[PDB]
Amino acid sequence: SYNYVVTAQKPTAVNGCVTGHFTSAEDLNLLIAKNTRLEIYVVTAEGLRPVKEVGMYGKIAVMELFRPKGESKDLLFILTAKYNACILEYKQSGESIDIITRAHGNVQDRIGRPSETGIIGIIDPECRMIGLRLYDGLFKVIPLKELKAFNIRLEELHVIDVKFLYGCQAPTICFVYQDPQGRHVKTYEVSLREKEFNKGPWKQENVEAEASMVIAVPEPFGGAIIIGQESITYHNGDKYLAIAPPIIKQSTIVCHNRVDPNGSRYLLGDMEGRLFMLLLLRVELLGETSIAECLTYLDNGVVFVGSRLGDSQLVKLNVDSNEQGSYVVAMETFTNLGPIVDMCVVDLERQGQGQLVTCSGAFKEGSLRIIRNGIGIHEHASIDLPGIKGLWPLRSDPNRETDDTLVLSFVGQTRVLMLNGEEVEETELMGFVDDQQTFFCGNVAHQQLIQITSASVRLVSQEPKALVSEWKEPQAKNISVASCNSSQVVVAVGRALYYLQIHPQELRQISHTEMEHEVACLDITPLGDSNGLSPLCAIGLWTDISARILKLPSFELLHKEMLGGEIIPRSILMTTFESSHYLLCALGDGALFYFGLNIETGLLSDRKKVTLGTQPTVLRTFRSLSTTNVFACSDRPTVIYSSNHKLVFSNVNLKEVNYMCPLNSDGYPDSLALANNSTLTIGTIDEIQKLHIRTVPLYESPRKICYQEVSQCFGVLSSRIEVQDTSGGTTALRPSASTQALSSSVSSSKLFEEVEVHNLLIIDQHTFEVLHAHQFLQNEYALSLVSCKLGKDPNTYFIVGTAMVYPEEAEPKQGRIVVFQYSDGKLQTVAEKEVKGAVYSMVEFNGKLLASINSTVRLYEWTTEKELRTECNHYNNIMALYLKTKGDFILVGDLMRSVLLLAYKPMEGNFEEIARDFNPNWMSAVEILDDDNFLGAENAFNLFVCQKTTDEERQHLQEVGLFHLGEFVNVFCHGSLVMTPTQGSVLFGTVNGMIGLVTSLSESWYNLLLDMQNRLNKVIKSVGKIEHSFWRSFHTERKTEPATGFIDGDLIESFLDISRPKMQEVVANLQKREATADDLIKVVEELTRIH
Amino acid sequence: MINFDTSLPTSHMYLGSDMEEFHGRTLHDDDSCQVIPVLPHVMVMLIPGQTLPLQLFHPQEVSMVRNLIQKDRTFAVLAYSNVREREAHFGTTAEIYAYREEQEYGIETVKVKAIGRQRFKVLEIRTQSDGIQQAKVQILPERVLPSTMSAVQLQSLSRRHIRAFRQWWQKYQKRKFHCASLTSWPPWLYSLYDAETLMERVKRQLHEWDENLKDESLPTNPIDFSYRVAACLPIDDALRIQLLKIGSAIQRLRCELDIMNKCTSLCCKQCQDTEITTKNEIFSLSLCGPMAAYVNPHGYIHETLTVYKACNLNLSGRPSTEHSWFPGYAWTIAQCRICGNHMGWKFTATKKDMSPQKFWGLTRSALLPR
Ligand SMILES: Nc1cccc2c1CN([C@H]1CCC(=O)NC1=O)C2=O
Ligand SMILES: [Zn+2]
C-alpha cells in the first residue's frame, strides 16, 4: 500500500507567543507558534503587520528571543518536540525575506525518561546559557555553533517549574520541586567553568501544596513569585510577602506576561478565561477573554490572547471600567478551528460541492465550523435584467469621488442605471446612445466620459452632459474590438487597429496599423509607475492563435506568443500582482494562459496553463482590501490573486458569472456588480483565500456530529458544565446552545462539585439554529451518534450510545441505545435499549445496527415491533472503542492499537475473527481505506496503515505505512471539499485545527514521487536545518524508524514553487522511462487539485 | 490478627540455608536471539520476578546446572501449551541466585533458587544426547508506554502534578486527564488505561488478601507489580500463557483485573462441579502473594495457594513437619471427597500461640476457576 498525505488547512491553534525586536531593533515584533508554523508580525499600533510566515520540520516546544551583547536585532531560539535546537536570525534585503540558521543541533539524550511536566526552555538574562529540563534528574546546558550541550545531575527529580533568576553575578535557577514530605521552592548556582551545580543564594523555603508557576521578576526587586491555587508568595532570602486573594480561588493561573519591563505589572490568566493584573502584592480582575494558552502585552494597552481551545484575540486594557465593570474590550477575533473532536462532509448548497462541518473548540469556546472551498459573495441588490453583455461603473458628478451610475450593454442596446443611494433606477445619460451595443464606457481625461459602441467612439463633457467629440472609422465600418483607459483608446475594425488620445473636447487619432489576421481581443492597461499612459498594447489574433505585445504609438511588435490550437483567444489582460507584471490570456475553450511580462522589452516568460470553465472566460480587474485582483467570469467564476509571488486561483461560490465590474457607490461601498444570464446582483466580496470558515458559537462543548438529509438538520452531541446548587440539582454557568434551544426536551428514566450535562442538539443545515435540545439523564454520558434507516423500516432515526458514569465505577456497568425520530420540530423516542456497559461506538451494518458494549460487539436487528433485537455477540477481550465497517467486514479498535477484524457470516449468523494485531501504542483514530487497507493515528503524532496464503499468514495483519505527521488526529472521514491519478479520499481533523487529506497511489507513482522527494530535499532550504527524512521518521520514546508507504504532499507541492532552474536540477535523470520537467509539472499540478 | 512471619515461605528454608549466593545479573538485549538450556523435569511456568526452587538429582540435570554456574547462570523455563506433547511457543529465562551441591546416597545432587527475568518466543527446540534440550529463543521486550495525555499536552496546563483520599482520586482523574477535552474520549476512559489507576484497583484486592500489608513491600513500578500479581493468581494454564504473551504492564493489569472480578469459585479440575474454595478464602501467607512455587523432596514443583477454609476435602494419614514449606506448620494430604483428586494439604500449627491455627495449601493444577 502506497498513500499520499497533504495539508488541506494549516494548524490554527496558538501553541505559544513572544514579543521582542527580531526583524529590527526598532520594530516591535510578535512571534506566534502555530505548531509546525511560525508567524512573524510588527505591532502597527493601528493593527498587526504580517511580515513573513515560515514552516518548520518539527513541532515547536520552546520559543524565546535573546540579544547576546553586540547584536543588530534579536536571535530566536526554537526547540522542537524531537529535540531539534536552533538559533534563527532575521534577514531582509528589498523584497527578499529569509530566516537564517545561526546555530543548530539535536539535544536528545542517548537514554532518559522525558519528564512529567513537559519540556522547559529557559535562558539566562545576560545571554550566558540555555537551560533545558527535558529529562527528570538532569539539567541540560547550552552556552550561547553545533549547539554543544552538557548535563548536571539534579538531586530533586520532580521539578514543577523553573526560571533563570535576575540580578546575579553567578547564574542561578529557582525551581519549585515536590518530594513525599511536601512541595518546596529551591535555588542552585550553575557554573560553566566547573560544569556542575553549587548551593544556591537562599534556603529551601516551603511553598503551597499546589504551587505551579515561578515568575522571574527583574531588578531592583530580584527573587521569584510563586503562584499556587489560592496563594501568590514571593521569596528573596529574608524578604518574603505571602498574599491569598479569594478572586483567584475558582480556577488555577495557567499563563502570565510582563507589562512593565522593571517588573511592577504582570498579566495573569486562568483556565476559565479570566484576566488578572498582578501589581507590585495586589491582584485585580480586568475581565474575560478567550481561554488563553499564552498572553502578550504589546504597545499601549493592546493585548494578544493566544488561545488553543478557541479563537485567538486582540483586546484593549482600559484604565476605565465599563457599565459591567470590565477593563477588557474585544478588538479582533482570529479564527481557530482546533480542536476538531468530530466532523462530517455534507453536499450543502450545491451537489458535488463538498462542505466540512466540524465539532470545534471546548467549553465556552465551543462551536461548529463550516469549511467550504471557495470565496463567497454577499448580495445587497438583485435586479431582473436578462442577457447583460457588459457592465461599467461611472461617476456622473466630477465633484463626487464615488460611482453614481452603472452602464449596461445588451444585444445591440445600451441601458443606464442611476444609484440614488440604495435605490437603483433606469435613466438616460445625455450624450450616450441607447440604440447601439457598448464595448466600453467610463470616466476619462479632462473631466469627460467616453462611450465606445459598434458604430463610433463618443466623447461626452460632464458639465453639462453633451457630445464634445465623435470618432468613426473612415469607411463608416463597425468597431469590432475596443480597449480604453483614461487618455488612450485602441480599437479594432477587423484586421485594422487605431490609436486615439483623449484630449479636452477632442479624440485625437495618433496612429493606425493593419494586422496579419483578424483582431480577437485588446488591452492597454497602464502598468508600473506609468501615469495613466500605457506604452504597450496587448493583442490576441484569430487563425494564427497568438498573444502579441505591441508598442504604442508605433504599433511595432515586441513579442508574439504562439498559444497553439484552433480555439481563438477571447479575453486578454495586462496586470500587476505583488509588484510583478503579468499577461493573462483567456481562450474560447475555457483555458487561461498566464505569463510574466517585462514592461520594457515586452517579453512573455514562464508560460502556465490553467483550466477554468467550459465557456470563454472574461477577465475584469477589481480592488479588494487595497489590493488588485482579477475576476475570471465563466461557469466556474474564479478570483486570480497573489500569494508568495505565485498566482492563486480560488473559485467563487456562484453557479455562473458572465460579466462583472467593481462598484463604489454611496449606497454600495467597495462592491461588485455581477451579471449572469437572468439577473444583475450588487454585493460584497469575502476574504480572498482558498477556504471559507463559518463560525457557529455554541458556548458549550460539541463532541459528536452526523447528518440526516430527510430532516435537513444535523444531530450534535454536546456537553455543558453546571455547578451543584443549594437544591436537589444543578445550575448553569452561562446560557449555551442546549439551554437556549427553540424546543427543549429531557430523557424519561426507566433504568435502575462541577457536573457535565449531556445533550443531543438538532441544528438546521442552513440557518444553523438550535431547533431542539434533548437533555440526557443525570450522570448519563453520551458517547456515540449515528443517523440511519434500519431493517425493513423506511424512517431515518438519530441513534445515541450512552454510558452511566459514577465516580465509584471504573468501567461503566450500565448504558443505553436510544432511538429518536425527528418529526414536527421535536425528537420522538422510539426505543430505549438498556445494555450492561458503555456504548463506545455504533455503526449501520448492511441494514442492521452494530454497537459496542464495552469489550463485546453486538449486532441488533430492527423488527416491525420497532425494537432493536440482539442477534450475534462477539466477546473480544479488548475494549471496542473504534468500530468501522465496509460491506460484511468489521474493524475493532482498542486505545492501545489492538486491532481485530471481524466478518459477519450471513448463513451462520455469527462473527468470524479474520485477522488480529497487538502492538501496544496509543491510538487516537482509525479509518478503513479499502477492502484490504486501513489508516490510523498512533502515539507521538504518527499515522500508519495496516494491510491484509497459509492460515497463520492470513490471520495476521501487516503494517505497510509509517509516517510522522506532527499532528494529533481525532477524526478520519471519507469525503472531499473539491467539485484517475489517485484512488479514494480520507480527510482528517486534528487538535491544532489542522485538516489533512489522504489518498492512494500506484507502485510507480509512489516511487516517482519518493525519488522526487529525495531530490527536492537536496534543493529546499530547511528552517533550523532539520532533515525532512528525520522529521517524518516514525517516532515513539522507543523506536525511531524512517517513514514508509507515505508521500509528503506538502513537500511534493513545493516543486511548483521552486525556481525553474532548480526544477530542472530536481528532474535531471529522475525517470526505466524518462521524466520531463513539463511532465512533472502536470503530475504535481494534478495532485494540488485533490484539495 | 496473623502473627506468622510472611517472609519465611519466600526464603525456602526447607531447601536448607548455607547456599552459595550470586549477586551479578545477566540481561539479554531485546529482540535478540539466544540459545538457552531447558531443564528436563520442570513442567511449571515461570513469570518474570517469580522465585523458582529446584531440587535436582538426575545426573544430566545436575551436570547441566553445575556447568551453568560456571557461566551465564540462566536457563529457559517453557510455558507448555500441551504438557503431554511437550509443546511450548513461549517461556521465561531463570537466573540462579542461590545454589548448593551435596553428595549423598551414592549420588551427586544440587539445590537451586532461581528467579524469572526475561520472557521469550521459542524459535526451535533442539535436543542433546544426554537428554537435556536447548532452545533458540527470541527475547520479548517489555513495552513501556508514556501517559495517555503526554502527546496531547505540549502546553501551559502540563505543570499540574499528581478514607478522605477518595476525593484525591477524583481530583487526580479531573487533573491528569483534563486534556481529554482536546480529544474524542472522556477522562474516565483514559483512567481505564492509566497505570497508577489500574494499580490502585489491583492494590484494592491485594489488601483484601494481605490484611497486615505495608505498601513499602509492594513494587512502585507497574512492570514488576503487574508480574508479581500474575504469579499469585490461581488460574488455569491456558489463561496464564495468555498473560505471559502480554507485553504491556497496562494490558496486563487490565487482564488481571478482569480475571480478579470474574474469579468467584475454585473447583476440582477433575470433577469440574465439586466446589473446593472461593476467592474470599484466599489470603497472602507469604510476601510473594497468596500463591508460590515450592519443591517437594523429589523435585516436583507445586504452585500452592493459601486459603483459610476449603470444603469438599478429605484428609489421609497423620500430620508431618518433614520438609514443610511453612515453618511452624504441619501438613496432611487433602483430596477431593468426590473423585479423590490430590488437592493439596491442610496445614495445622505445631504451637498453640500461632496465627492462623490452620489453613489450606491448594495446588493450582488441581483447581479450576469454573
Ligand atoms: N514427604 C514427602 C514425600 C513425597 C512428596 C511430598 C512429601 C512432602 N511434600 C510436601 C508437603 C507440604 C509441604 O509443606 N512440603 C512438602 O514437601 C510432598 O509433596
Ligand atoms: Zn474431584
Short mmCIF file of C-alpha atoms in Angstrom, two decimals, chain A residues 57 1012-1013 1015-1023 1026 1028 1050-1055 1057-1058 1062 1066:
data_model
loop_
_atom_site.label_atom_id
_atom_site.label_comp_id
_atom_site.label_asym_id
_atom_site.label_seq_id
_atom_site.Cartn_x
_atom_site.Cartn_y
_atom_site.Cartn_z
CA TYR A 57 10.19 20.39 10.24
CA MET A 1012 11.46 13.30 -6.36
CA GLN A 1013 11.24 13.86 -2.52
CA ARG A 1015 15.85 15.27 -4.92
CA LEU A 1016 13.57 18.13 -3.66
CA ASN A 1017 15.24 17.87 -0.25
CA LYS A 1018 18.69 18.48 -1.75
CA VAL A 1019 17.47 21.89 -3.10
CA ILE A 1020 14.92 23.19 -0.47
CA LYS A 1021 16.45 25.08 2.47
CA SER A 1022 15.06 23.84 5.86
CA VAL A 1023 14.28 26.32 8.70
CA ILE A 1026 16.30 19.90 10.13
CA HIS A 1028 12.99 16.20 6.20
CA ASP A 1050 3.37 19.42 1.38
CA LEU A 1051 6.95 18.69 0.15
CA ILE A 1052 5.81 17.49 -3.32
CA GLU A 1053 3.60 20.64 -3.76
CA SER A 1054 6.63 22.95 -3.16
CA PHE A 1055 8.06 21.73 -6.57
CA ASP A 1057 7.12 26.87 -6.03
CA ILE A 1058 10.93 26.37 -6.59
CA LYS A 1062 16.00 24.26 -9.63
CA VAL A 1066 15.33 18.03 -9.46
#
